[PDB]
């Protein structure tokens, strides 16, 4: 579910927020993206990649 405030569980990482399509290009060995505050601000979908 995108563009809506949801609880999410991505590969065991739980949280709450709004998921939108991202322009970030993750490297193949990367699953999560983190900002200056170490918070998970980007995530690779385990199914759609």
């Amino acid at each position: 579910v995108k563009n809506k405030c949801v609880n999410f569980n991505f590969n065991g990482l739980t949280g709450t927020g709004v998921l939108t399509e991202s322009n970030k290009k993750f490297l193949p060995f990367q699953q999560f993206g983190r900002d200056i505050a170490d918070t998970t601000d980007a995530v690779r979908d385990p199914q759609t990649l």
Partner: protein, 278 residues
């Protein structure tokens, strides 16, 4: 099967400067447009790096260098290779490179990549050898003289078959490939990167972050390592398999990692483009 190579001219060891190379991604977390400070085993900036050659210069005396010494493995190794004919074929890691202890072997067989953690009775002069047939004008793998015996083999991995053309290319070094080897908590961490480059003499100057390649669960003690190269044989260079060989032009640079704090710069695309050694 072990062969003790001869007719090697004695030269003093060579040293060079690692300007900003050896930086790798500390973790697997995407970061963009950020300055991230991290403490890890990094190669210090502008460090004194040992330099080894493989070249057969024509002449009366000339130089016939085939440098495969047993170098220390203190806390981590930055290994750069400037090669064009795929001379650097792999490495062996261990403490006593014989059957008493277990050793890791990462080699390229020109058909597969073999990673074996096992008790190897390594040769005093381990290497590989490619024969050049004049009739075919073709290069074929013919010699594998890394170890004499292998026993109590605990870890084995063979990659999918490939070709890995073995032609003795002439001219400029067309491939700079960098590795970072670490041995932490029973894990052999390998980070790798490759850049085209175009030069003849020294280690390239620039910045290129190494990406995580593999984490081998070997669980062995490593204090020394030796590079396995490939020599060339053909209708030229006659001999008794100890002098009848020539070395394709290649070079490799070895530096040592230390616990350092680095300030890395992640651009808008998540690529580490610069670093500061604090």
């Amino acid at each position: 099967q072990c062969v003790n190579l001869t007719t090697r001219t004695q030269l003093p060891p060579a040293y060079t400067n690692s300007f900003t190379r050896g930086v790798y991604y500390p973790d697997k977390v995407f970061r963009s447009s950020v300055l991230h400070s991290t403490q890890d085993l990094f190669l210090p900036f502008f460090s004194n790096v040992t330099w080894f050659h493989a070249i057969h210069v024509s002449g009366t005396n000339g130089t016939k260098r085939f440098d495969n010494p047993v170098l220390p493995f203190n806390d981590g190794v930055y290994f750069a290779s400037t090669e064009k004919s795929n001379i650097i074929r792999g490495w062996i890691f261990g403490t006593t490179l014989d059957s008493k202890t277990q050793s890791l072997l990462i080699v390229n067989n020109a058909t597969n990549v073999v990673i074996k953690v096992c008790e190897f009775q390594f040769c005093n002069d381990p290497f590989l050898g490619v024969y050049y047939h004049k009739n075919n004008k073709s290069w074929m793998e013919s010699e594998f003289r890394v170890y004499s015996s292998a026993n109590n083999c605990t870890f084995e991995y063979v990659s999918q078959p490939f070709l890995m053309d073995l032609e003795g290319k002439q001219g400029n070094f067309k491939n700079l490939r960098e590795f970072v080897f670490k041995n932490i908590d029973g894990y052999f961490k390998i980070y790798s990167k490759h850049t085209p480059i175009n030069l003849v003499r020294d280690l390239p100057q620039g910045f290129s972050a190494l990406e995580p390649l593999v984490d081998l669960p070997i669980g062995i003690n490593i204090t020394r390592f030796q590079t396995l190269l490939a020599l060339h044989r053909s209708y030229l260079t006659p001999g008794d398999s100890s002098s009848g060989w020539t070395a394709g032009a290649a070079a490799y640079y070895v530096g040592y990692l230390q616990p350092r704090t680095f300030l890395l710069k992640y651009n808008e695309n998540g690529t580490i483009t610069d670093a500061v050694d604090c």
